[model samples]
Target: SSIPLYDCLIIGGGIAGLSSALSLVRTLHTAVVFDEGIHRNDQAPHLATVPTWDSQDPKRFRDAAKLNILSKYSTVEFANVKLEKVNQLTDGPYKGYFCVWDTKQRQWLGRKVILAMGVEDLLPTIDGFAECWTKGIFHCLVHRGYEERGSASGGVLAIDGDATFFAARHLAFQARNLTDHVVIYTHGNDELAQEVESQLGPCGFRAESRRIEKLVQHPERAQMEVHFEDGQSETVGFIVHRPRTSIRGPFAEQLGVEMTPEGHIKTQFPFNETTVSGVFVAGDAGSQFKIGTQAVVMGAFAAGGVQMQVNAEKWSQP
Candidate 1:
């Protein structure tokens, strides 16, 4: 069977994938983005900290990006389906090419493959948590409206327990930056409670060790109430958590790419190429920090890395 050749093939249709495609097409490179339409930020009310598009609706941001790509470049295409499998070729004329299989049983070959697949936010299971996710509850500080919960209302700030002592302290610092009211719930991990309190004391943060019974909303009060198993409750403007993300698909799994301790694909700096040659990673998949601005920057760099590969090969051959 004959497979169409492309300068680059991008996986995952989120900010990273689309952003990579935009960069590639602008360079006159033929790129195809295969997305299953499942994105990590699908439910995000608005994209924040993104230049020129800050505080804009996520859907509208994506639509604008797609339209820009389609109207400007005929060489760029999108496959609104999941990719089944992908791997680097071992030997032949396309020895370095990436072979891909899609859910529709389509075959594709590309000089380079960009993994723009973003990561999923793993939230703790609590009744009504999923419903208010992104709407009122968030995991990071980059969300535009976080500061609104600051001293203006004297709203309490809560930080969920993280894996490490430093991680929890870090969030407390960032949380304090946004609001003077700060509290840390170790979520039953009392081992580092003292350590956190000691370090966070100067910053005016308190640490608590309690088993969170569940989280409920007081919509009329415009606050998310964190209810403790001990029959106590505290109303907070919002909750900031550290997410443990995972890569579900076989695309990266099958390639044997090295992953960081935090579960993100490990890639070299300046160039976003993963441990595997001819395979580059971008966005939340490889980034230690997941933010809109960072995703866009990674996508742009991944394109330049793929372009380096295409250019180097062509420049050396007759």
Candidate 2:
């Protein structure tokens, strides 16, 4: 059935969308979250934790995160579909707004639209990088449960730069609780590196800061090793790195919204509305908060501040 008018429509299935749904359906509003189920963790070939421990798949952790949010609210809808189009609101309360008034495949009119579709990752170009990337290798060390979810062989992560330290700390936490040891590889010293190092502390990870020259995979052992340009070697259960990626989907350009210097969706004034009145951008889809948790929190701000011109009429603008 067509939603004649919805309080909010959230796009994406990641933590941000799910969390935003929780905020929208509050005790009163009507909302639906189109999952688009492009879950990255679901594609993991083999996830790891401590040496002897088998860490749960990263998807499971993500699911758990969503379930935890859902347990507190049951009104939000989770759908399995993709978004194809969006529009800039030119009339109504959302006089200057953005909305997915109609997707190429279907029409979903909403009083307000929340863009929570998280960003995608680009893979390494090395041979077998893709094959081993998801298998026993990862892009980020999500929550600590992955280590306990692995087998006795332990795990190894060849990470570089900001991602290296984050991967090291997160993997280390899981390692301390699930494995006997772990190692990390670094490439650059971004702002996040210090934070990662501070968090790792006594259990800091092992790292080799150099460009990756090659990758070797041991399928039976469920492990991968990296040979660096510096003529160094590292063996780890996973290779985690922030990949080069691009902002996708018909977001800003489609909505006639201007983009900031960062290639992000730019919103209008007075509550940061989009060129399309009824649309709001939040989470990684709008502006990468760099962390999912923070992304969800920002989505909440976008959802709550949205009020129909009618709703605003009920109470004077505060």
Candidate 3:
């Protein structure tokens, strides 16, 4: 017997991919979700902005989603494997299908592809950063209420955009919302510091060009101490950073999908269709808004696009 084609192939088993599959499984016969199994909130002890699961354990939150979906849909499947490569078929029975290669060199076939894989933040290697990350260090500042803590009242903004200056600009405002005493650090770049000060100083912001020596947590004070190379130290309640993020792995190269100038996948709104036909982009892989609510919405939107594309194919055939 010939192998059956999947109604949709979703890459990345995070909120976006799984949510897309949940939507697709309702209307389609077969929907498979591929996940490398690394939850983005794995480091986060409790989810902040998630609505129903707010303040809930990350593991429990994710497990509830899996259980709810798997219990309802028999046609839905989950694969815990890393996608190695994506090759578009040009001929034979799978001409329109994109051939996805797994890490073990196995191939999975799908009629329509949903690119829900998320981006990887390229946080710099700073002293004591690895241990303090997600503990006292955070990337985005608009989470539900991480700012309510004392460690969030007097915080430092680590701006590291040397090339485009885009992240630096956005982070300035995020830091401004947290505290008026936002200190911008450019990793010892005097020119960048001067530019930030000129743009944000009117708002009572300060810029620092000194090299960061290390970050030491002050448990008693409930804050992080920023030590500088010039024998200066400031204890802030928390630290906010603007790190450049890129689409992790080779999804872009493998699928040959177009990307935005900011390095995110280019997709149309409402439907989330990519430039490539029968391919949809969802979540942080495509959207500039990196909030959890937005990811869930876009994932469902991408699934709708896949459903429409599938319906069109059925209508075109004899």
Candidate 4:
């Protein structure tokens, strides 16, 4: 196998992977970034709080970043394919190296690996919920809540359990800062509804116990109509609901990296190094705090860590 070994193999091509590749190339390291073209924020309309690129379309921002790297950096290559497996090489000239196979069975070798594959949001199973996601429905109040401020009333979906109930209470309070009226819907959970009312009612937050049948976007108004099982409907400016998330694939399991109970990759602080030697992680896969700026910073940190390891190996070679 006349395979050309790269300094690092990045298993994602979003902000984190791109940033890693950019940093690696600046240090004159050869690398390849694999991307399946699926992103956690693909449905998001705009990015917030990112300097200079705030309010810009996230797709455009990613495209521009990718383009800039590809045009100027010859040491870095981009692979538009799905990675199937990654394994550490042993007992060969490339011992201690990592080899990855894509969906097409093509193999690539690298001295180090960066897993920036990110996470997948598991949305609720309700009629019209997917359509309203990122538009009339949002997860993070920090990014999407301000747009609906003072427009009308807001709602929070929090019927799952105690954790959801408390989380929803927090979101409802945040919504209160944006709108005068905020409702925490328990979806026919009367006991939870009573709990919410008892705890937050005096704070001017309303608790609705009706089971939700569907969510519909109003055609002529900037509102989302929540249709209940009993045929009653209420319109709100927006809704806050945080769905559970999982890492995208079985790469983490295959690599044997330690994971947090919530499914995020467990990494060492500052460098984002995973439990597996020569393998690192960044972006949403590495932390509960999922943000573009943080991912970029982590990617840079991972790249520096990989570069340091590569330098040490080269310097110690006899």
Candidate 5:
């Protein structure tokens, strides 16, 4: 019962994983991809700013990538299962190799590991916020702003805290380009509201201190009605808010890899290699710019790094 050994193990099947797999196959390296079928942008209606595939469905991009890799690369394989544990061997015949077991108890071996697992958005507890996420509410203005520009007024939901306050101000500036009327909702933070008004008053931006009770989407239009605890409501074409994020799983911790202060997997510059030897990271799990274009670029870099290691190790062996 010998486990199948691959040159590299690429986890997660989104853009990064697929891109790395393609790269590895082109370099003639055998690789296996383990995907659990979850993706960060599944709810996003369309992709933006990606050349040749802008405005396309996220599923279409993923499916096309999978098809392209599988069709041309016989050395690449896909596994639709979750890995339960991964350990790097320290001694024995497989020393320095990573051994992983899936939920099915099937074991596999790889010389190097690439973690492409993305992050999970931790949304707020406000009513109806989850339902409208990526629909009426968005995070990245660069990706979704052009479609809603000039439609109507836009808003930025500023959560309590200095970081969120600064982040909200930045979002408001971006929203201003799409619409003249921009409101910063401080949600019962009167101090923040006053500060926002004083700082941005000259720029014609308004600040609201009412606590948001719930959000309701317009029946016929692409708009959201933000209801306050005081029973007042304001409709906006779209709202920009950044939710906190966490790594999707405990894989990095299990592998003893270091994490960045911002909660992403820590990696070396240009190569995307993790703090742990023989481990690499790409995509949202290791990036601040959590977009498809950046993921693809990082994936290619990770592949190159893995290839270099593999070649050096092969030649070093007497």
Candidate 6:
């Protein structure tokens, strides 16, 4: 089948890939981005503050990343699609093809490929967990917490790990107007959790540490079952789980791109070009520890590096 062509094609719409798209176009690189719209953290309800890395709302960061690339390079193309598979042309001088799923007409094609499809958030392990996800089971910060507090009891919040600490704090601030009694449900990490309690408790917050298990959905109020290995259950409203995530993209395996042991695409340097010469991989699909900013760097680097390599000495600086 005839496939659409682009000088540079980026995958995944997360920050890393989107940031890279901005970087490539500023240097006069013609690029195209294949956005799978996979959230950087779709499963987890809260985002840990990576110092300055965290934004007010997750989408704010995402949109800014996309805008960064789009503003500089008007020629940059954004194909709202998902890439399925790829195959490297064995014997050829930089000739290859990548097949992707087009969302509009729903099809696939062949061409130069950059993989950054990102990860999917899954939480099937916990009992009754899916019932609360995103409804009152928020995975990350929503700008809507203040309004939500009107229905909640004294703005009580439940959280897990470092990320949830930040999320709880953000929500606490959001709902402070409605209520002052905020509760933190730590799944039993005394040391780290104590630090969280100390910080927020001064504001009259309470912390509960217990291993969680079954979640008994109650009509008036769903109670959480925090059954320790010893067997006990405590009820809670907001719970956050940071499940182990997997970096996924079919093209990397198909195109023969090298991967990190963590199961993500491996790039040699500043650009996110894969070991497969002409083939490049960007965004979350590139690495397991993949961050949004890094994706931007890799995406821009891959395209510019390839361009410079082809022209040889045309670029003013290395």
TM-score of each: 0.88, 0.63, 0.87, 0.94, 0.95, 0.60
Model 6 lDDT per residue over 1-318, tens place: 244544556666666556656666666655667776667555433344443544355666667666765665586777776666455555544355444555355543334555667766556455666665554444433422433444443323343333366765665555455544555555555653686678987777776665456555555542344455457665444443444456676566666677777667787776666888767776667665555455556666666654665345344457
| Candidate 4: tens digits of C-alpha lDDT, residues 245-298 | 888878999989999886799998778999999899999999988888988999
lDDT of 2 by residue, 1-318 (tens): 443566677777776666666666664666667776675446764334423323546566657757775777665666666778766567866554335633446755666677766666667576667767655565555632254355443443334333544455655555544445554444443344455445654654443446667778787744777777778876665544556555557665676666666555675543445556666776665664445556656666676666444267446766
lDDT of 2 at 52: 30
Model 2 root mean square deviation, Cα atoms = 7.3
Q: Candidate 4, 98: how far from true, in Å?
A: 0.6
Write one digit per residue (lDDT tens) for candidate 1, span 1-318. Answer: 365789898997788888888888877888889888878877776788787877778888888999988987888898887888998889987787888888778888998989987877777786667765665566776673454455322222233436467777676666677676777777776776677778876767777778678777666543577788899987776666655677758878889998888788999888789998889998888877877778888999999998888988878998
Model 5 TM-score, 2 decimals: 0.95
* Candidate 2: Cα lDDT at 208: 40
Candidate 5 ranges with C-alpha deviation above 4 Å: 91-93, 160-164
Worst lDDT 10-window in candidate 3:
144-153
All candidates' lDDT scores? 0.77, 0.58, 0.76, 0.87, 0.87, 0.57
Best by TM-score: 5
After the best TM-score superposition of candidate 6, give how far the Cα of residue 185 lies from its true spot, in angstroms: 11
Give the distance in Å from residue 313's predicted Cα in candidate 3 to where it truly belongs: 1.6
Question: 1-318, model 3: which lDDT tens digit per residue?
Answer: 277678888888888887897788788557778889886667775776778777788778767888888888887788899988876699987787877888899888888888888887777788877666676777666652254443344455455553224556666566666665677777677887787788878877777888888888765433688899988987776677756787877977777888888888888767888888888988888877766787889889999988888888888899
Backbone collision count in every prediction? 0, 32, 1, 0, 0, 14
Which regions of candidate 4 are displaced past 4 Å? 91-93, 161-165, 219-222
Q: Is candidate 2 or 5 superior in TM-score?
A: 5
Candidate 5 C-alpha lDDT tens digits along 1-318: 376778899889998999899899998898889999889998888888778888899899889888988787789899999987888988988888998788889888999999998888889889998887888888889888788889679998888332355777898999999998999988888988898888898889999989999998775655899999988888998888888888877689899998878778998987899999889998999888788888999999999999999989888999
lDDT score, candidate 4, position 187: 80
**Evaluation by TM-score, superior candidate among 1 and 5:** 5
